[PDB]
UniProtKB/Swiss-Prot annotation, chains A, C:
Pfam families: Tubulin (PF00091), Tubulin_C (PF03953). It is linked to Cortical dysplasia, complex, with other brain malformations 4: A disorder of aberrant neuronal migration and disturbed axonal guidance. Clinical features include early-onset seizures, microcephaly, spastic tetraplegia, and various malformations of cortical development, such as agyria, posterior or frontal pachygyria, thick cortex, and subcortical band heterotopia and thin corpus callosum in some patients. This is Tubulin gamma-1 chain. SUPFAM superfamilies: Tubulin C-terminal domain-like (SSF55307), Tubulin nucleotide-binding domain-like (SSF52490). Tubulin is the major constituent of microtubules, protein filaments consisting of alpha- and beta-tubulin heterodimers. Gamma-tubulin is a key component of the gamma-tubulin ring complex (gTuRC) which mediates microtubule nucleation. The gTuRC regulates the minus-end nucleation of alpha-beta tubulin heterodimers that grow into microtubule protafilaments, a critical step in centrosome duplication and spindle formation. CDD domains: gamma_tubulin. The modification Phosphoserine is found at S119. Keywords: Cytoplasm, Cytoskeleton, Disease variant, GTP-binding, Lissencephaly, Microtubule, Nucleotide-binding, Phosphoprotein. It comes from the Eukaryota. Its main location: cytoplasm. Belongs to the tubulin family. It is found in: Cytoplasm, Cytoskeleton, Microtubule organizing center, Centrosome; Cytoplasm, Cytoskeleton, Spindle.
From Swiss-Prot, chain B:
Belongs to the TUBGCP family. Component of the gamma-tubulin ring complex (gTuRC) consisting of TUBGCP2, TUBGCP3, TUBGCP4, TUBGCP5 and TUBGCP6 and gamma-tubulin TUBG1 or TUBG2. TUBGCP2, TUBGCP3, TUBGCP4, TUBGCP5 and TUBGCP6 assemble in a 5:5:2:1:1 stoichiometry; each is associated with a gamma-tubulin, thereby arranging 14 gamma-tubulins in a helical manner. Gamma-tubulin at the first position is blocked by TUBGCP3 at the last position, allowing 13 protafilaments to grow into a microtubule. Signal peptide: none annotated. Component of the gamma-tubulin ring complex (gTuRC) which mediates microtubule nucleation. The gTuRC regulates the minus-end nucleation of alpha-beta tubulin heterodimers that grow into microtubule protafilaments, a critical step in centrosome duplication and spindle formation. It is found in: Cytoplasm, Cytoskeleton, Microtubule organizing center, Centrosome. It comes from the Eukaryota. This is Gamma-tubulin complex component 3. Ubiquitously expressed.
Length: 420, 61, 420
């Protein structure tokens, strides 16, 4: 069933814009949405179809206090993305309250697309954690979608902000977003600003324009994470089928990313897997262990060697994990597309459930706890205080995210069979 | 009068013999007699249909 | 018998201009009316035959306070439309009064064409509801034609204005037009501006210039609704024969439209029917139910598949209706024309009697009722007051349209066998 992408907030709209442009170039699509003359792929799921093979994506672009959405409109690809579904503070509470008043019209925008599609599997949110306008509104919309579509699933490509720690209310905002995400999101794929910036310093000399270039890194991860759906293959021909292995327990649904040729601008599968398990490739910044690992390879891959590659990588034991989970790593394959450069002919990505990210959650919880004792930035404006006089949803989020941290470490423990 | 027409049109346009063109026209005509109620067995059904048209002209008056 | 199109008002003349241009391109006609050299169609009804193959349509273009009719004149197709039949406020009363003084010579323009044609079935009005000059004059002319031609019928391609609610007397104007249309119009095909921007959402990059580019939408619908007449087929070879199914009771003669490939710029008949019944393909913005549905498909449709589609649609039950009327949904076919692009060569439209349009009527009656209690905008002009001192034609229209609303809901209840 077709997937609808709910890109919201300035940062979320930037990364959704780049992702859809990336899939325009990758697929047989021109900047006006026209089927390319030069042009074997399952474009049904992500792009709505005309018989001349015009392909407008099912993007929902939500703008609040718009600045960069005007730049999105003044682009060559404005004709490409036209579901005509753009409807007009830096605080989570301000974003939540601003979302509440316009919830019906944006949800009617959702309903129109849901009706238009033959059918609907999933809502993929290009969400921004502690994203000012993006956060709060994304949390409220996340709470609305599950209630309205209980059977359906929500994924969140959360760009978790770590910038070495400007917004002073970041821990507060992020803490609230994680409560809503922990109880009201089926899946989350986490990315890190410091991790991608460190990769940027590694591969290039770019330091100052981090955000503009890191968009490309995020877009490559996003496209590669869906390529197995976008192109037919033997297995994982549907999102839920892929998601099941990656998320073994509902609470621990946050996923790690990695990409073998970070400098993708011949290598055997043994090499790409071994490279992939190394930490410099990992794009995320007491014993600790993975819960489950999965890897997808797109290129000139010889088929007899992929089992032998998994066997060798087992001998290497580069990835150490003794979780409660029995999930073993699996070598999966997808189709490298034509018309784009085939540099580094074999190129792979991994999605994994790893307990290390509990550390990153605990870092923002630590910042929040310190800030909370100080009460240096309680916000308590007319908006903040009136919306939250008790300020007790913050403590509710603190206990929920603390449950999540404890659950992660319990998953590390041998006895997650018992309650975590 | 359209499915049988397509069927005939295929069985003529592929065929390369007039003895088969004849025998395709034949089965088209016979199949229209049966899809319509003009057969020698559907006489009662045809009479009923005429008796439902009778009420239409009655209403006209 | 030949059909004459009484296009009036600025907006009505715009859509009649575009409709006749659309049928010029579709038929074997050049911009000077000459038979095209490159050129199986029944052009008798819509295009008068000149001796030297000037196919001049039977268009009666009525201008009042002309601005856009001069632009219509300075066009390449001015020679195409040359019956030489053009004869020179924003209030319904102003339009009606202005029409009254010119009523004889415009009626002589009708008489001349009626005599010139071999014979005459129908008057098709490109009418604009609450169109300033268009409304009032169209209502008066509608009242004159039925008296002068009691046997003959009037259809109205009413572009009912919904623009999210500038014309401040719009509810009053639309109210009076609906009284005249309810009691003095044989058929009405309802069109909506908000629904037309909403049908334009996903199909073309026409978000901001919608009203400018909704002309093409209206033109496609108008052409497709007549294609079964303009091109020969086994059934519905006359306007009245088609109309009879669509309007089962005289009062409820307002028809909803829909078009399967909104992005018409292979699909089986099963697919086009199921798509068409969905609300996105629909272009109109307590139980509610259709009274009767009809669909026409123009394309290379396989014949042993249309009946598959009919009964498959019966199993799907995508269209829910339990009216008093016994008229079931029916599959019809027409001929796709040559010389134009056959992209999505199968392509369909639907005309249906739906009770939902009662809601759209009741919205303008709500606006009128509120405005009427306030009496903010009575206009109080000397034209308005002198022409209606009592202001009781507004109340007569209110009770007549309220009867229409009650009759729609009467069609909904199981006992429309009694008086509605």
């Amino acid at each position: 069933r077709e997937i609808i992408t709910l890109q919201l907030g300035q940062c979320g709209n930037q990364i959704g814009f780049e992702f859809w442009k990336q899939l325009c170039a990758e697929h047989g699509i021109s900047p006006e949405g026209i089927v390319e003359e030069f042009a074997t792929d399952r474009k049904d799921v992500f792009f709505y179809q005309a018989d001349d093979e015009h392909y407008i994506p099912r993007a929902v672009l939500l703008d609040l206090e718009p600045r960069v959405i005007h730049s999105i409109l003044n682009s060559p690809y404005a004709k490409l993305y036209n579901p005509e579904n753009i409807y007009l503070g830096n605080n989570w509470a301000s974003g939540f309250s601003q979302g509440e008043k316009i919830h019906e019209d944006i949800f009617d925008i959702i309903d129109r697309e849901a009706d238009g599609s033959d059918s609907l599997e999933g809502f993929v949110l290009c969400h921004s954690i502690a994203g000012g306008t993006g956060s709060g509104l994304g949390s409220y919309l996340l709470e609305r979608l599950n209630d309205r579509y209980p059977k359906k699933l929500v994924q969140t490509y959360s760009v978790f902000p770590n910038q070495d720690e400007d917004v002073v209310v970041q821990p507060y905002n992020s803490l609230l977003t994680l409560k809503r995400l922990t109880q009201n999101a089926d899946c989350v794929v986490v990315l890190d600003n410091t991790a991608l910036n460190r990769i940027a310093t590694d591969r290039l000399h770019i330091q100052n324009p981090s955000f503009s270039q890191i968009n490309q890194l995020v877009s490559t991860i996003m496209s590669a994470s869906t390529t197995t759906l976008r192109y037919p293959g033997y297995m994982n021909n549907d999102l839920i089928g892929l998601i099941a292995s990656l998320i073994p327990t509902p609470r621990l649904h946050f996923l790690m990313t990695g990409y073998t040729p970070l400098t993708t601008d011949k290598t055997t599968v043994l090499d790409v897997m071994r490279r992939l398990l190394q930490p410099k490739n990992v794009m995320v910044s007491t014993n600790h262990c993975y819960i489950a690992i999965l890897n997808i390879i797109q290129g000139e891959v010889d088929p007899t060697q992929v089992h032998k590659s998994l066997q060798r990588i087992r001998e290497r034991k580069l990835a150490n994990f003794i979780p409660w989970g029995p999930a073993s790593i699996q070598v999966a394959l997808s189709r490298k597309s034509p018309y784009l450069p085939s540099a580094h002919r074999v190129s792979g990505l991994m999605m994994a459930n790893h307990t290390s990210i509990s550390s990153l959650f605990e870092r923002t919880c630590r910042q929040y706890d310190k800030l909370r004792k100080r009460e240096a930035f309680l916000e308590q404006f007319r908006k903040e205080d009136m919306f939250k006089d008790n300020f007790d949803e913050m403590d509710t989020s603190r206990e929920i995210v603390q449950q999540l941290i404890d659950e992660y470490h319990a998953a590390t423990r041998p006895d997650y069979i018992s309650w975590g | 009068l359209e499915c049988s027409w397509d069927e005939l049109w295929n069985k003529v346009q592929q065929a390369q013999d007039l003895d088969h063109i004849i025998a395709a026209h034949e089965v088209f005509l016979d199949t229209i007699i049966s899809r319509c109620l003009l057969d020698s067995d559907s006489r009662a059904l045809l009479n009923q249909l005429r008796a439902v048209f009778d009420q239409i002209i009655e209403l006209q008056n």
